[PDB]
Amino acid sequence: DETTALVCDNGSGLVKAGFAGDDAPRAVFPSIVGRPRHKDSYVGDEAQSKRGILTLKYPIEHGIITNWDDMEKIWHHTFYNELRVAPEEHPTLLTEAPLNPKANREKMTQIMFETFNVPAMYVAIQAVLSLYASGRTTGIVLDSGDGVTHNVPIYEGYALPHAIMRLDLAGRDLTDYLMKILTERGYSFVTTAEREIVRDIKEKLCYVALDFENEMATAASSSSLEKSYELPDGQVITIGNERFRCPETLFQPSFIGMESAGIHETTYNSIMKCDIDIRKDLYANNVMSGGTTMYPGIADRMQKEITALAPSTMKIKIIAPPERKYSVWIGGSILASLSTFQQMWITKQEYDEAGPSIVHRKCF
Amino acid sequence: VEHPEFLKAGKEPGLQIWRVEKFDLVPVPTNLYGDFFTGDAYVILKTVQLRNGNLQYDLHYWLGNECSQDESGAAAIFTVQLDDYLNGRAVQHREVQGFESATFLGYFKSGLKYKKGGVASGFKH
Ligand SMILES: Nc1ncnc2c1ncn2[C@@H]1O[C@H](COP(=O)(O)OP(=O)(O)OP(=O)(O)O)[C@@H](O)[C@H]1O
Ligand SMILES: [Ca+2]
Ligand SMILES: [Ca+2]
Ligand SMILES: [Ca+2]
């Protein structure tokens, strides 16, 4: 862990950080910065704990860095508080959202070199790293986290920017929804401390129905879909059709009053925006990536949903690896570890000579 | 890329086979071609002479049933990198054990063979 590459995967809700060559991130924490309402700041768990006296802020919105001052705190905390490294000693790989604006990629390069003094850095698209982690160079990635959902088709190692789809419906929106319907059932989940409990219920008991209508009817009959959940306070609650109604929103955004098409449609749509000659390869390599793709039953519903949309003779395959909450990070750890990757890094020397614009020619 | 194996790839007609070994591209002894460890991942480059004088390229990354994620991930990346180094002229093919394409199976005149085992993972767990 001395003069070892670092991999930092910055998400809207969670930062995934660690060392290249490890099979998992060493640090996972909330991408949050807390400041005194009225040290000068807290980050991550510390900020969440002292939430009561702090003003919380999320520097990344829908996968895009939006508050540069708060992002430097995140990175500082990542280096010094979580990884316990001297940044100037480690080449650092960062990840970015597909369609990440030009000036944002430059800004990220500048801060790393100018504020953190890294000896080298690199920016890679999150979805591409997920594909690499599943051992593929061609496929279409469904990346869904806490703030954004994207469909990213990739051919022979490179995203097809023209065919990428972005949807501002994800984990946080699902958590908020489960909150609303659960109190609707008779319970009461309103408080931030309660939002946290719901998120845990969302992650532990929810699932995606293979046929939503039948599921609803089957939940109105017996109580074989009902599950119990023990509150922090010891009280037990019974969760019902909400287990599958909450992630249904991914397929029917109308539930939350969103006008967009579901994730099966945006997938079919992204694929249809690609050259006809590669569609078969896309359809047979549907890789699921991120936290909001963890619902049990998600891979079977999408398998069902896209075979219905696609020509009957299309071989369809959904790949939903158990470790897909960390696929992006893992992809980065493999990439940065390769013998052939050493000349890929942007050096401090190259940065001083060319400036932040170097990122557009070195990372694409 | 200045990797020595990159400098050797696609220089002349024939078949080149490399095995992924702890995040590196390691050449396979030519006497061992066709004998694949099912616990490992490999990168195969087939170079054919075109009558136009130019060289045609087919890159195949072969994944054994028991290969670790770092090996399958690296074989895929090495493939992309070898293609780019070859000015994107290579056509990439994913080959999974038991589902290899007729083309790839055809590279091996005495038939491809599977053998249990392989080099250990490169990850730190
Ligand atoms: N088992 C699970 N079931 C459902 N949702 C889950 C599960 N595990 C984690 N999540 C959710 O996934 C989200 C975090 O996932 P992820 O780390 O991939 O997102 P991110 O990178 O922070 O966000 P984004 O990609 O939107 O910028 C949170 O909404 C969390 O509640
Ligand atoms: Ca993410
Ligand atoms: Ca192996
Ligand atoms: Ca090519």
Coordinates of C-alpha atoms and ligand atoms in Angstrom, one line a residue:
Chain A
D1 CA 0.0 0.0 0.0
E2 CA 3.2 2.3 -0.4
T3 CA 3.4 3.9 -3.9
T4 CA 0.3 2.0 -5.0
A5 CA -2.4 3.3 -7.3
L6 CA -5.7 4.4 -5.7
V7 CA -9.1 4.0 -7.1
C8 CA -11.8 6.5 -6.1
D9 CA -15.3 6.0 -7.4
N10 CA -17.4 9.1 -6.5
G11 CA -21.1 8.6 -6.6
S12 CA -24.1 10.8 -5.8
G13 CA -24.8 9.0 -2.6
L14 CA -21.6 7.0 -1.8
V15 CA -17.9 7.3 -2.3
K16 CA -16.2 3.9 -3.0
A17 CA -12.4 4.1 -2.4
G18 CA -9.4 1.8 -2.1
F19 CA -6.2 0.5 -3.7
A20 CA -5.6 -0.9 -7.2
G21 CA -5.2 -4.7 -7.0
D22 CA -7.6 -5.2 -4.1
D23 CA -10.8 -7.1 -5.0
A24 CA -13.0 -4.6 -3.1
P25 CA -13.1 -0.9 -1.9
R26 CA -11.4 -0.4 1.5
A27 CA -13.7 2.6 2.3
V28 CA -17.4 3.1 1.5
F29 CA -19.1 6.2 2.9
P30 CA -21.8 8.8 2.2
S31 CA -20.8 11.6 -0.2
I32 CA -21.9 14.3 2.2
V33 CA -20.4 17.4 3.6
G34 CA -21.7 18.9 6.9
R35 CA -21.1 22.4 8.0
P36 CA -22.1 24.3 11.2
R37 CA -25.6 25.6 10.9
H38 CA -25.2 28.6 13.4
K39 CA -13.8 21.7 12.7
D40 CA -15.5 23.8 10.0
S41 CA -16.8 20.7 8.4
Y42 CA -17.5 16.9 8.6
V43 CA -17.7 14.3 5.9
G44 CA -19.5 11.0 5.5
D45 CA -20.7 9.0 8.6
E46 CA -19.4 11.7 10.9
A47 CA -21.6 14.3 9.1
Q48 CA -24.7 12.0 9.2
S49 CA -24.3 11.4 13.0
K50 CA -24.0 15.1 13.8
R51 CA -26.7 15.8 11.2
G52 CA -28.7 17.5 14.0
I53 CA -26.3 20.4 14.3
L54 CA -25.2 20.5 10.7
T55 CA -26.3 21.7 7.3
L56 CA -25.9 18.7 4.9
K57 CA -24.9 19.0 1.3
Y58 CA -24.4 16.6 -1.5
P59 CA -21.6 17.8 -3.9
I60 CA -22.6 15.3 -6.6
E61 CA -26.0 15.7 -8.2
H62 CA -27.2 12.9 -10.5
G63 CA -23.6 11.7 -10.9
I64 CA -22.3 15.1 -11.8
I65 CA -19.9 17.1 -9.5
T66 CA -21.8 20.3 -8.8
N67 CA -20.1 21.8 -5.7
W68 CA -16.4 22.1 -6.2
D69 CA -15.6 23.4 -2.7
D70 CA -17.4 20.5 -1.1
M71 CA -15.9 18.0 -3.4
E72 CA -12.3 18.9 -2.4
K73 CA -13.4 18.1 1.3
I74 CA -14.7 14.7 0.1
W75 CA -11.4 14.0 -1.6
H76 CA -9.3 15.3 1.3
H77 CA -11.3 13.1 3.7
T78 CA -10.9 10.1 1.3
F79 CA -7.2 10.5 1.2
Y80 CA -6.4 11.5 4.8
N81 CA -9.3 10.2 6.8
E82 CA -10.3 7.0 5.0
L83 CA -7.4 5.7 3.0
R84 CA -4.7 7.2 5.3
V85 CA -2.3 7.9 2.4
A86 CA -0.1 10.9 1.3
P87 CA -1.8 11.7 -2.0
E88 CA 1.5 12.9 -3.5
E89 CA 2.7 9.3 -3.3
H90 CA -0.1 7.6 -5.3
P91 CA -1.2 7.7 -8.9
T92 CA -5.0 8.2 -8.6
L93 CA -7.8 6.9 -10.8
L94 CA -11.1 8.7 -10.6
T95 CA -14.4 7.8 -12.2
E96 CA -17.0 9.9 -14.0
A97 CA -20.5 9.8 -15.2
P98 CA -21.1 9.2 -18.9
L99 CA -21.6 12.6 -20.8
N100 CA -19.6 14.3 -18.1
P101 CA -19.2 17.9 -19.2
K102 CA -15.8 18.9 -20.6
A103 CA -15.1 21.6 -18.0
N104 CA -15.9 19.2 -15.2
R105 CA -13.3 16.7 -16.4
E106 CA -10.7 19.6 -16.5
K107 CA -11.7 20.8 -13.0
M108 CA -11.2 17.3 -11.6
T109 CA -7.7 17.0 -13.2
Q110 CA -6.7 20.5 -11.9
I111 CA -7.7 19.8 -8.3
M112 CA -5.9 16.5 -8.2
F113 CA -2.7 18.0 -9.6
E114 CA -2.9 21.5 -8.1
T115 CA -4.6 20.9 -4.7
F116 CA -3.6 17.3 -3.9
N117 CA -0.3 17.0 -5.8
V118 CA -0.9 13.5 -7.1
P119 CA 2.1 12.2 -9.2
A120 CA -0.4 10.9 -11.8
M121 CA -4.1 10.6 -12.4
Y122 CA -6.7 9.2 -14.8
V123 CA -10.5 9.6 -15.4
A124 CA -12.6 6.6 -16.6
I125 CA -16.3 6.3 -17.4
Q126 CA -18.1 4.4 -14.6
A127 CA -20.2 2.3 -16.9
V128 CA -17.2 1.2 -19.0
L129 CA -15.4 0.0 -15.9
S130 CA -18.5 -2.1 -14.9
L131 CA -18.4 -3.7 -18.4
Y132 CA -14.7 -4.5 -18.0
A133 CA -15.3 -6.0 -14.6
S134 CA -17.8 -8.4 -16.1
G135 CA -15.1 -9.5 -18.6
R136 CA -16.6 -7.9 -21.7
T137 CA -15.6 -5.2 -24.2
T138 CA -19.1 -5.1 -25.8
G139 CA -22.4 -4.8 -24.0
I140 CA -24.9 -2.3 -22.7
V141 CA -24.7 -1.3 -19.1
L142 CA -27.6 -0.4 -16.9
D143 CA -26.0 1.7 -14.1
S144 CA -28.4 2.8 -11.4
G145 CA -27.2 4.3 -8.1
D146 CA -28.6 6.8 -5.6
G147 CA -29.0 9.8 -7.9
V148 CA -28.9 8.7 -11.5
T149 CA -29.8 5.8 -13.9
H150 CA -28.0 5.5 -17.3
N151 CA -28.1 3.1 -20.2
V152 CA -24.6 3.0 -21.7
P153 CA -24.0 0.9 -24.9
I154 CA -20.3 0.1 -25.4
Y155 CA -18.6 -1.4 -28.4
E156 CA -15.1 -2.8 -28.5
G157 CA -14.2 -0.9 -25.3
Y158 CA -15.8 2.5 -26.0
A159 CA -19.1 4.1 -25.1
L160 CA -21.3 5.3 -27.9
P161 CA -22.2 8.8 -26.6
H162 CA -25.0 9.4 -29.1
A163 CA -26.9 6.4 -27.7
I164 CA -26.6 6.9 -24.0
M165 CA -29.7 7.5 -21.9
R166 CA -29.9 9.3 -18.6
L167 CA -32.8 9.1 -16.2
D168 CA -33.0 11.2 -13.0
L169 CA -34.8 8.5 -11.1
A170 CA -32.9 6.3 -8.7
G171 CA -32.2 5.0 -5.2
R172 CA -33.0 8.2 -3.3
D173 CA -36.3 8.5 -5.2
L174 CA -37.2 4.9 -4.4
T175 CA -36.4 5.4 -0.7
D176 CA -38.6 8.5 -0.6
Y177 CA -41.4 6.6 -2.3
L178 CA -41.3 3.6 0.0
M179 CA -41.5 6.1 2.8
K180 CA -44.8 7.6 1.4
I181 CA -46.6 4.3 0.7
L182 CA -45.5 2.7 4.0
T183 CA -47.0 5.6 6.0
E184 CA -50.0 5.2 3.6
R185 CA -50.4 1.6 4.9
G186 CA -50.9 3.0 8.4
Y187 CA -47.3 3.3 9.6
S188 CA -45.5 6.6 9.9
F189 CA -42.1 7.4 8.3
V190 CA -41.4 11.1 8.0
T191 CA -38.2 11.9 9.9
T192 CA -34.6 11.8 8.5
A193 CA -33.8 9.1 11.2
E194 CA -36.9 7.3 9.8
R195 CA -35.7 7.9 6.1
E196 CA -32.7 5.8 7.2
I197 CA -34.8 3.0 8.5
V198 CA -36.8 2.9 5.2
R199 CA -33.6 2.7 3.2
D200 CA -32.6 -0.4 5.2
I201 CA -36.1 -1.8 4.6
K202 CA -35.8 -0.9 1.0
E203 CA -32.5 -2.9 0.8
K204 CA -33.5 -5.9 2.8
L205 CA -37.1 -6.7 2.0
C206 CA -37.9 -5.2 -1.4
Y207 CA -37.9 -7.1 -4.7
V208 CA -39.0 -6.8 -8.3
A209 CA -42.1 -8.7 -9.3
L210 CA -42.0 -10.8 -12.5
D211 CA -45.6 -9.9 -13.3
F212 CA -46.7 -6.8 -11.4
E213 CA -50.5 -7.3 -11.8
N214 CA -50.5 -10.9 -10.7
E215 CA -48.3 -9.9 -7.8
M216 CA -50.7 -7.2 -6.7
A217 CA -53.6 -9.8 -6.8
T218 CA -51.5 -12.4 -5.1
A219 CA -50.9 -9.9 -2.3
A220 CA -54.6 -9.2 -1.9
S221 CA -55.3 -12.9 -1.5
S222 CA -53.2 -14.8 1.2
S223 CA -50.3 -13.1 3.0
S224 CA -47.5 -15.2 1.6
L225 CA -45.7 -12.1 0.3
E226 CA -45.8 -10.4 3.7
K227 CA -42.5 -10.0 5.7
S228 CA -41.5 -8.9 9.1
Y229 CA -39.1 -6.1 10.0
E230 CA -37.6 -5.4 13.4
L231 CA -37.3 -1.7 14.2
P232 CA -34.2 -0.3 16.0
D233 CA -36.5 0.3 19.0
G234 CA -37.5 -3.4 19.0
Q235 CA -41.0 -3.0 17.5
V236 CA -42.0 -5.3 14.6
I237 CA -43.8 -4.1 11.5
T238 CA -45.3 -6.1 8.6
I239 CA -44.4 -5.1 5.0
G240 CA -46.7 -6.1 2.2
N241 CA -47.2 -5.1 -1.5
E242 CA -44.8 -2.3 -0.9
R243 CA -41.9 -4.8 -1.1
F244 CA -42.5 -4.9 -4.9
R245 CA -44.4 -1.6 -5.4
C246 CA -41.4 0.5 -4.5
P247 CA -38.9 -0.8 -7.2
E248 CA -41.8 -1.1 -9.7
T249 CA -41.2 2.7 -10.1
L250 CA -38.1 1.8 -12.1
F251 CA -40.4 0.3 -14.8
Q252 CA -43.3 2.7 -14.3
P253 CA -42.0 6.2 -13.4
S254 CA -45.6 7.4 -13.5
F255 CA -45.8 6.1 -9.9
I256 CA -43.8 9.1 -8.7
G257 CA -45.3 11.5 -11.2
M258 CA -42.4 11.2 -13.7
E259 CA -43.2 11.3 -17.4
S260 CA -40.2 9.3 -18.6
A261 CA -40.2 5.7 -19.9
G262 CA -39.2 2.8 -17.7
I263 CA -35.7 1.3 -17.6
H264 CA -36.7 -1.6 -19.9
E265 CA -37.8 0.9 -22.5
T266 CA -34.8 3.2 -22.1
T267 CA -32.7 0.1 -22.6
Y268 CA -34.5 -1.0 -25.7
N269 CA -34.3 2.6 -26.9
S270 CA -30.6 3.0 -26.3
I271 CA -29.9 -0.3 -28.2
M272 CA -32.1 0.8 -31.1
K273 CA -30.1 4.0 -31.4
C274 CA -27.0 1.9 -32.2
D275 CA -25.9 0.5 -35.5
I276 CA -28.1 -2.5 -36.5
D277 CA -24.9 -4.6 -36.9
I278 CA -24.1 -4.5 -33.2
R279 CA -27.6 -4.8 -31.6
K280 CA -27.3 -8.6 -31.2
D281 CA -24.1 -8.2 -29.2
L282 CA -25.8 -5.5 -27.1
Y283 CA -28.9 -7.6 -26.4
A284 CA -26.8 -10.6 -25.4
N285 CA -24.6 -8.5 -23.0
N286 CA -26.9 -6.5 -20.7
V287 CA -24.8 -5.8 -17.6
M288 CA -26.5 -4.5 -14.5
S289 CA -24.4 -2.2 -12.3
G290 CA -24.9 -0.2 -9.1
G291 CA -26.8 -0.3 -5.8
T292 CA -30.3 0.3 -7.3
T293 CA -29.9 -2.8 -9.5
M294 CA -29.6 -5.0 -6.3
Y295 CA -33.3 -5.8 -6.0
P296 CA -34.0 -9.6 -6.2
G297 CA -36.0 -10.4 -9.3
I298 CA -34.6 -7.3 -11.2
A299 CA -32.6 -9.5 -13.7
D300 CA -35.6 -11.8 -14.5
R301 CA -38.0 -8.8 -15.0
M302 CA -35.7 -7.1 -17.3
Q303 CA -35.1 -10.4 -19.1
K304 CA -38.8 -10.7 -19.5
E305 CA -39.3 -7.0 -20.3
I306 CA -36.8 -6.8 -23.1
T307 CA -37.6 -10.1 -24.8
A308 CA -41.1 -8.7 -25.2
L309 CA -39.8 -5.6 -26.8
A310 CA -37.1 -7.2 -29.0
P311 CA -37.5 -9.4 -32.1
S312 CA -38.5 -12.9 -31.0
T313 CA -35.2 -14.4 -32.4
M314 CA -32.9 -12.2 -30.3
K315 CA -30.8 -14.0 -27.8
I316 CA -31.2 -11.9 -24.7
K317 CA -29.0 -12.1 -21.6
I318 CA -29.0 -10.1 -18.3
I319 CA -25.8 -10.2 -16.3
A320 CA -26.4 -9.1 -12.7
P321 CA -23.2 -10.0 -10.7
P322 CA -23.7 -10.4 -6.9
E323 CA -20.9 -7.8 -6.4
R324 CA -22.4 -5.2 -8.8
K325 CA -22.7 -2.5 -6.1
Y326 CA -18.8 -2.4 -6.5
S327 CA -18.5 -3.3 -10.2
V328 CA -17.3 0.2 -11.2
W329 CA -14.7 0.2 -8.4
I330 CA -13.5 -3.3 -9.3
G331 CA -13.2 -2.4 -12.9
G332 CA -11.0 0.5 -11.9
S333 CA -8.9 -1.6 -9.6
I334 CA -8.2 -4.0 -12.5
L335 CA -7.5 -1.3 -15.0
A336 CA -5.1 0.6 -12.8
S337 CA -3.3 -2.7 -11.9
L338 CA -2.4 -3.7 -15.5
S339 CA 1.2 -3.8 -16.7
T340 CA 0.1 -2.0 -19.9
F341 CA -1.6 0.8 -18.0
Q342 CA 1.5 2.5 -16.7
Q343 CA 1.9 4.7 -19.9
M344 CA -1.8 5.6 -19.8
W345 CA -1.7 7.8 -16.7
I346 CA -1.5 11.5 -17.0
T347 CA 1.8 12.5 -15.3
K348 CA 2.4 15.7 -13.3
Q349 CA 5.0 16.5 -16.0
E350 CA 2.3 16.2 -18.8
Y351 CA -0.1 18.4 -16.8
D352 CA 2.5 21.1 -16.2
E353 CA 3.3 21.1 -19.9
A354 CA -0.3 20.9 -21.3
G355 CA -2.6 22.0 -18.5
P356 CA -6.1 20.6 -17.6
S357 CA -7.0 20.2 -21.4
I358 CA -4.7 17.1 -21.4
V359 CA -7.6 15.1 -20.0
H360 CA -9.5 15.2 -23.3
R361 CA -6.6 13.6 -25.2
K362 CA -5.5 11.1 -22.6
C363 CA -8.9 9.9 -21.2
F364 CA -11.7 9.0 -23.8
Chain B
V1 CA 1.9 1.2 -25.1
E2 CA 5.6 0.2 -25.1
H3 CA 4.9 -3.3 -23.6
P4 CA 7.3 -5.8 -25.4
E5 CA 4.5 -8.1 -26.2
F6 CA 2.7 -5.2 -27.9
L7 CA 5.8 -4.6 -30.0
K8 CA 5.6 -8.3 -31.1
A9 CA 1.9 -8.5 -31.8
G10 CA 0.6 -8.7 -35.4
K11 CA 4.0 -8.2 -37.0
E12 CA 3.5 -11.2 -39.4
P13 CA 0.9 -13.8 -40.4
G14 CA 0.2 -16.5 -37.8
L15 CA -1.2 -17.2 -34.4
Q16 CA -0.1 -15.5 -31.1
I17 CA -1.3 -16.6 -27.7
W18 CA -0.8 -14.9 -24.4
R19 CA -2.0 -15.8 -21.0
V20 CA -3.1 -13.3 -18.4
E21 CA -0.8 -13.7 -15.4
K22 CA -1.3 -11.5 -12.4
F23 CA -2.3 -8.4 -14.4
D24 CA 0.3 -9.0 -17.1
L25 CA 0.2 -10.3 -20.7
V26 CA 2.5 -13.4 -20.8
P27 CA 3.4 -15.3 -23.9
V28 CA 2.4 -18.9 -24.1
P29 CA 5.1 -21.4 -25.2
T30 CA 4.2 -22.2 -28.8
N31 CA 4.5 -25.9 -27.9
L32 CA 1.6 -25.4 -25.5
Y33 CA -0.9 -23.8 -27.9
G34 CA -4.3 -25.3 -27.8
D35 CA -3.9 -26.5 -24.2
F36 CA -6.1 -24.1 -22.1
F37 CA -6.2 -23.9 -18.3
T38 CA -9.9 -23.6 -17.4
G39 CA -8.9 -21.5 -14.4
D40 CA -7.3 -18.9 -16.6
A41 CA -8.0 -16.3 -19.3
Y42 CA -6.1 -15.9 -22.5
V43 CA -5.7 -13.4 -25.4
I44 CA -5.4 -14.8 -28.9
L45 CA -4.3 -12.8 -31.9
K46 CA -4.9 -14.3 -35.4
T47 CA -3.0 -12.4 -38.2
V48 CA -3.9 -13.3 -41.8
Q49 CA -2.2 -12.0 -44.9
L50 CA -4.4 -10.0 -47.2
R51 CA -3.7 -9.9 -51.0
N52 CA -3.7 -6.1 -50.7
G53 CA -0.4 -6.6 -48.8
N54 CA -2.1 -5.6 -45.5
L55 CA -2.7 -7.7 -42.4
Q56 CA -6.1 -8.7 -41.1
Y57 CA -6.6 -9.1 -37.4
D58 CA -8.9 -11.1 -35.1
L59 CA -8.6 -10.7 -31.4
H60 CA -10.2 -13.3 -29.1
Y61 CA -10.2 -13.3 -25.4
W62 CA -10.9 -16.8 -24.0
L63 CA -12.3 -17.2 -20.5
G64 CA -12.0 -20.4 -18.5
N65 CA -15.0 -21.6 -16.4
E66 CA -12.9 -21.1 -13.2
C67 CA -10.9 -18.0 -14.1
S68 CA -11.0 -15.2 -11.5
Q69 CA -12.6 -11.8 -12.2
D70 CA -9.2 -10.0 -12.4
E71 CA -8.1 -12.4 -15.2
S72 CA -11.4 -12.1 -17.2
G73 CA -11.4 -8.3 -16.7
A74 CA -7.7 -8.0 -17.8
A75 CA -8.1 -10.1 -20.9
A76 CA -11.0 -7.8 -22.0
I77 CA -8.9 -4.6 -21.4
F78 CA -5.7 -6.1 -23.0
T79 CA -8.0 -6.9 -26.0
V80 CA -9.2 -3.3 -26.3
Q81 CA -5.6 -2.1 -25.9
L82 CA -4.2 -4.5 -28.5
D83 CA -7.0 -3.4 -30.9
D84 CA -6.2 0.3 -30.4
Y85 CA -2.5 -0.4 -30.8
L86 CA -3.4 -2.0 -34.2
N87 CA -5.2 1.2 -35.2
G88 CA -8.6 -0.4 -34.2
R89 CA -8.2 -2.8 -37.2
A90 CA -8.9 -5.9 -35.1
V91 CA -12.4 -7.4 -34.7
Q92 CA -12.9 -8.5 -31.1
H93 CA -14.5 -11.7 -30.0
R94 CA -15.4 -13.0 -26.6
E95 CA -14.8 -16.7 -26.2
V96 CA -16.3 -18.6 -23.3
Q97 CA -15.4 -22.2 -22.4
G98 CA -17.8 -24.5 -24.0
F99 CA -19.3 -21.8 -26.3
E100 CA -16.4 -21.0 -28.5
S101 CA -17.1 -19.9 -32.1
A102 CA -16.4 -22.1 -35.1
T103 CA -13.7 -19.6 -36.3
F104 CA -11.7 -19.7 -33.0
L105 CA -12.1 -23.5 -32.8
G106 CA -10.6 -23.6 -36.3
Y107 CA -7.3 -22.0 -35.3
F108 CA -6.4 -25.3 -33.6
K109 CA -5.7 -28.0 -36.2
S110 CA -5.4 -30.8 -33.7
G111 CA -8.4 -29.6 -31.7
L112 CA -8.3 -27.3 -28.7
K113 CA -8.1 -29.0 -25.2
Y114 CA -9.2 -28.1 -21.7
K115 CA -7.1 -28.8 -18.6
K116 CA -8.0 -28.1 -15.0
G117 CA -6.0 -25.5 -13.0
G118 CA -4.1 -22.3 -13.7
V119 CA -2.1 -19.4 -12.4
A120 CA -3.4 -17.9 -9.1
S121 CA -5.4 -14.6 -9.0
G122 CA -3.6 -11.2 -8.9
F123 CA -6.1 -9.7 -6.4
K124 CA -5.4 -9.1 -2.8
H125 CA -8.4 -10.3 -0.6
Ligands
LIG1 N1 -29.6 -4.3 -1.6 C1 -30.0 -3.2 -2.2 N2 -31.2 -3.1 -2.7 C2 -31.7 -1.9 -3.2 N3 -31.0 -0.7 -3.2 C3 -29.8 -0.8 -2.7 C4 -29.2 -2.0 -2.2 N4 -27.9 -1.7 -1.7 C5 -27.7 -0.5 -2.0 N5 -28.8 0.2 -2.5 C6 -29.0 1.6 -2.9 O1 -28.1 1.9 -3.9 C7 -27.7 3.3 -3.7 C8 -26.2 3.4 -3.6 O2 -25.7 2.8 -4.8 P1 -24.4 3.2 -5.6 O3 -23.2 3.2 -4.7 O4 -24.2 2.4 -6.8 O5 -24.7 4.8 -6.0 P2 -23.9 6.1 -6.3 O6 -22.6 5.8 -7.0 O7 -23.7 6.8 -4.9 O8 -24.9 7.0 -7.1 P3 -25.0 7.4 -8.6 O9 -24.5 6.3 -9.5 O10 -26.5 7.7 -8.8 O11 -24.2 8.7 -8.8 C9 -28.5 3.8 -2.5 O12 -29.7 4.4 -3.0 C10 -28.8 2.6 -1.7 O13 -30.0 2.7 -0.9
CA2 CA -22.2 5.5 -9.3
CA3 CA -6.3 -18.3 -12.7
CA4 CA -11.4 -2.9 -33.7

